[PDB]
């Protein structure tokens with residue numbers, strides 16, 4: 001005698017439900033493309049100091065006299081000769097491969113080498129803030145108006161970032177884009193789960209994952225189609241405009257209406273669902289009286305000792321997983337092969353890794369799967385960072401294996417943290433873990449910023465942190481017995497056993 005009873009009465013596989021899920025999961029390809037866009041919209045082409053116009057190249061016999069060479073047989077990327085001196089007349093970029101990126105229009109090079117990483121860090125700060133505050137805003141307003149606001153904000157911010165007079169405007173609009181995009185990312189699954197019955201909830205989760213993979217495909221497709229960054233960003237952001245346009249056709253989740261103390265809206269929504277589903281005859285029996293008889297915290301997380309330890313461990317796990325995943329995904333320039341091919345192979349490797357990880361976690365365990373994922377990924381990143389730049393195919397195979405390992409790690413940590421926490425604070429634990437993953441994704445570009453000290457130290461850290469987290473995760477209890485802890489006391493009793 002719960003909400004699921006009425007949900008099954010009205011259907012569960014009906015036309016409205018399938019249409020709504022296949023409609024709401026649709027912008028997740030644009031989610032993936034927007035998250036990974038910095039690879040194609042901020043690629044660094046080879047460049048050198050432009051010789052001053054005072055000297056003539058006709059009498060100089062070439063451009064070698066006005067440009068010092070580096071050890072790799074290329075003109076120096078930050079110096080120019082006096083007859084040395086830093087760039088004073090700008091930079092010269094080629095157009096053989098990348099017609100234009102941000103580092104060629106606003107010359108984010110030399111002294112301003114860290115500005116692209118700072119912009120990505122600001123986008124991740126926007127992601128964190130648009131999760132933190134928009135979760136409360138959605139809980140206080142709803143799950144449809146918030147979604148349409150997310151659509152509008154992400155589309156407007158994408159277009160405005162595409163047409164940016166300078167770099168500060170770009171960073172601010174990336175902040176706003178992260179806000180809206182994180183909010184839609186965390187509200188899509190919530191609304192879809194809250195409308196689906198029990199089994200189609202897991203079906204919807206798998207659908208969301210597969211759509212993410214298809215989006216990783218679509219990013220490479222668009223990048224091959226559109227090379228210009230000012231046009232690539234516009235092409236990625238345009239379908240979000242029609243998304244906001246047609247997002248008014250969604251139906252709000254009835255569970256949120258019930259939780260708000262009102263049931264007439266719930267009855268109206270269910271009757272509308274039956275009308276779309278065609279089961280008006282069965283939905284007519286629904287009424288306020290029937291619904292009335294059928295519809296019947298972070299402080300303590302850091303207060304309780306065992307809860308505090310468990311939160312610390314889960315925080316480290318989420319932090320390292322997001323760290324490694326974003327750091328490895330957002331670097332497809334120094335891997336030899338072209339960006340589009342490596343990106344499409346990255347998208348292809350996602351699904352088999354997820355299938356293998358699901359088989360492993362349902363076969364032998366979850367914590368050993370997290371071991372064989374995180375430690376393997378860390379070792380892969382270390383050996384990638386130590387392998388000389390000359391090797392290309394080995395580096396690319398290592399990178400795709402690492403991306404598959406990170407996807408498997410993400411799935412395993414989600415499915416493990418879902419059944420770890422007691423039911424009292426499980427949702428808050430999931431939210432805290434997601435926040436820790438987002439702050440790890442915040443810090444990862446900041447770590448990559450430190451490539452000035454050493455060209456390979458960002459990869460070294462990106463590998464090392466997962467290794468430490470894998471060592472840390474060995475102290476977590478195994479949850480193959482499916483005890484499903486209820487409260488803190490139940491957690492304590494099963495901990496000893």
Ligand SMILES: O=C(O)CCC(=O)C(=O)O
Pocket residue numbers: 205208209210212213350354407410411
């Ligand atoms: O592929 C990703 O971006 C995340 C992993 C995934 O498929 C999911 O979280 O559903």
Ligand SMILES: [Cl-]
Pocket residue numbers: 131182185186434
């Ligand atoms: Cl998120």
